[PDB]
């Protein structure tokens, strides 16, 4: 029920503003001073300008390094988030990965949905759930997900915890 | 702490799936069956096909009424989220509201950021904080936001509670 730092960086629904206090709402108390995510009155910084930082809430990072939506952000120059240009990846783009866990399709484009995540998906949130590590010949994971104890890719206590075969383990 | 139904529709950072248990992570335990938001393996329905329901995580609602990112979801016939087309609103669209609290700019386009939410913002999360209520000749807020006892528009207990003047006041 908490958002931002107080709620493990959780984001509010429907672009509600996460106040300084870790509560979702709308109006000055939430979006004004200290707003952590959502439609903050002051746009958070991103992309080169903030040295590669992502925008919260799938916002577009403009050519000037500001977070938002609309042509100004998502259009010409967009540096991240759901940009209007088609985003290339995988084998077709020198092995690049999609930002924010997007699935790299069999064709080499970044998205979400079964066309991207389904059979052939190369990296990110694939729905294919292909085995990793030991019982699958030292096969890591894309994105540095953790290869559980079952040679299963993911993130969370169960993949990064104890028995963690590869990637981003918890120690 | 929790996301989804368990955490007031709280969403996970970076497209992580919210499992049926209200926790954020990645893999088939979070994204598989019962996933609530983020990169779910089963895309939610939206738009006309699902009687106006909007996607979580600012995903695009395709022409076919499925949530996702990429050209098939945000391109032609996109019905919501950060569509590739400039989305019309406000006067320039007969008073229509932008979805998900987005700002309606002065020129009648939906977005987030100064250029949309600042000076001339018509509806949504404007940051101009124009006064409402008794002291502002009884103007009501757009979007059914609450007019607090002090003449400010927002959503939260300070706005919708004790002394709320108009909008979705608590009762």
């Amino acid at each position: 029920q908490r958002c931002g730092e107080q709620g493990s960086n959780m984001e509010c629904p429907n672009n509600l503003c996460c106040s300084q206090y870790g509560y979702c709402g709308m109006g000055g108390d939430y979006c004004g001073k200290g707003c952590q995510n959502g439609a903050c009155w002051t746009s958070k910084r991103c992309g080169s300008q903030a040295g590669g930082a992502t925008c919260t809430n799938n916002q577009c990072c403009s050519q000037y390094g500001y977070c938002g939506f609309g042509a100004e952000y998502c259009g010409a120059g967009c540096q991240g988030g759901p940009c209007r240009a088609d985003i290339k990846c995988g084998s077709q783009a020198g092995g690049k990965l999609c930002p924010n866990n997007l699935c790299c399709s069999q064709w080499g484009f970044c998205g979400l949905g079964s066309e991207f995540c389904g059979g052939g998906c190369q990296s990110g949130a694939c729905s294919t759930d292909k085995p990793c590590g030991k019982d699958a010949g030292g096969r890591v994971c894309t994105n540095n997900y953790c290869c559980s104890k079952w040679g299963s890719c993911g993130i969370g206590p169960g993949y990064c915890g104890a028995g963690c075969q590869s990637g981003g383990c918890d120690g | 702490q929790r996301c989804g139904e368990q955490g007031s529709n709280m969403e996970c950072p970076n497209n992580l799936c919210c499992s049926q248990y209200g926790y954020c992570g990645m893999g088939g335990d979070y994204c598989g069956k019962g996933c609530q938001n983020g990169a779910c393996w089963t895309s939610k329905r939206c738009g006309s096909q699902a009687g106006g329901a909007t996607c979580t995580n600012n995903q695009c609602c395709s022409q076919y009424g499925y949530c996702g990112f990429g050209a098939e979801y945000c391109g032609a016939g996109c019905q919501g989220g950060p569509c590739r087309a400039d989305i019309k609103c406000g006067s320039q669209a007969g008073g229509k509201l932008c979805p998900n609290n987005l700002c309606c700019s002065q020129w009648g386009f939906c977005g987030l950021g100064s250029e949309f939410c600042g000076g001339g913002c018509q509806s949504g999360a404007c940051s101009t904080d124009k006064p409402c209520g008794k002291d502002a000749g009884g103007r009501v807020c757009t979007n059914n936001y609450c007019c607090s006892k002090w003449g400010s528009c927002g959503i939260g207990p300070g706005y919708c509670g004790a002394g709320c003047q108009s909008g979705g006041c608590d009762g």
Partner: peptide, 8 residues
Amino acid sequence: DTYAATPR
């Protein structure tokens, strides 16, 4: 593009 049952 297929998997999971979509109504039609």
